[PDB]
């Protein structure tokens, strides 16, 4: 198999200062859905690992979150792309869970789901906590410049060997060039 793990806000869809709280607030970033479609057609398994503290904060309920992902799924499907699974942390910053990035919980759950070693698995994020979670779990971190990515890059302290791309479309192009 060829696994790739993606953060959601700031990588697939536009981040929001106010949280993404409804389907209308979920807006794909240019090229991101097409990027997923390319990887899908090249036989990659694409999985999300996303912090969704909006649930713990009571900003929206699981029905609404499922509707957001339904919107994503439909948009991707028409392009021939598929997200195989969504791993998500519903907790807030001080809720003491195992799954909130930068903890590696979700990445560990993904490894268990597919029964794989995460060595060399690309994990794409826009925030330092994405890179740290992925690196701790054994992945190869990739940082995009959408979302929080420019700030993350500027602040440094990235895991050694983190690769930097302008957006998810550029990441997919690089993976497929180097295939």
- Catalytic residue list: 7, 9
Please give the size of the binding site for Zn ion, defined by CB under 5 A.
Answer: 5
Q: Which long-range contacts (CB under 8 A, 24 or more apart) does 60-69 make?
A: 60/21, 60/22, 64/21, 64/22, 64/23, 67/22, 67/23, 68/20, 68/22, 68/23, 68/26
Residue choice 8, 91, 101, 108 for contact with Zn ion (CB under 5 A): 91
- Grouping H, G, I as helix, E, B as strand and the rest as coil, residue 13 is strand
Residues of this chain that interact with Mg ion (CB under 5 A) are 7, 9-10, 31, 126, 167, 169
Nearer to Zn ion, 83 or 89 (CB): 89
Task: Check if the beta carbon of residue 116 is closer than 8 Å to that of residue 80.
Answer: no
7 binds, among Zn ion, Mg ion, none (CB under 5 to 8 A by kind): Mg ion
Minimum separation from the CB atom of position 120 to Zn ion (A): 26
Instruction: Give the annotated binding-site residues.
Output: 7, 9, 15-19, 50-53, 57, 89, 91, 97, 99-100, 126, 129
């Amino acid at each position: 198999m060829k696994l790739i793990i993606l953060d959601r806000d700031g990588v697939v869809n536009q981040d929001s200062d106010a949280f993404v709280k409804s389907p209308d607030e979920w807006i794909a970033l240019p090229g991101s859905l097409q990027a997923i479609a390319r990887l899908t057609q090249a036989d990659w398994t694409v999985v999300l690992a996303t912090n969704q503290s909006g649930l713990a904060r009571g900003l929206f309920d699981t029905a609404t979150l499922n509707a957001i992902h339904d919107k994503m799924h439909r948009a991707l499907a028409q392009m021939g792309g598929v997200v195989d699974a969504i791993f998500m942390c519903p907790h807030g910053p001080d809720d003491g869970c195992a799954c909130r990035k930068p903890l590696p919980g979700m990445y560990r759950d993904i490894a268990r789901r597919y029964d794989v070693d995460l060595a060399g698995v690309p994990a794409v994020g826009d925030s330092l906590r994405d890179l740290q979670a992925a690196a701790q779990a054994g992945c190869a971190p990739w940082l995009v410049q959408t979302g929080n990515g420019r700030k993350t890059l500027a602040q440094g302290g990235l895991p050694e060997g983190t690769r930097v791309c302008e957006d998810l479309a550029a990441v997919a192009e690089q993976l497929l060039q180097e295939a």
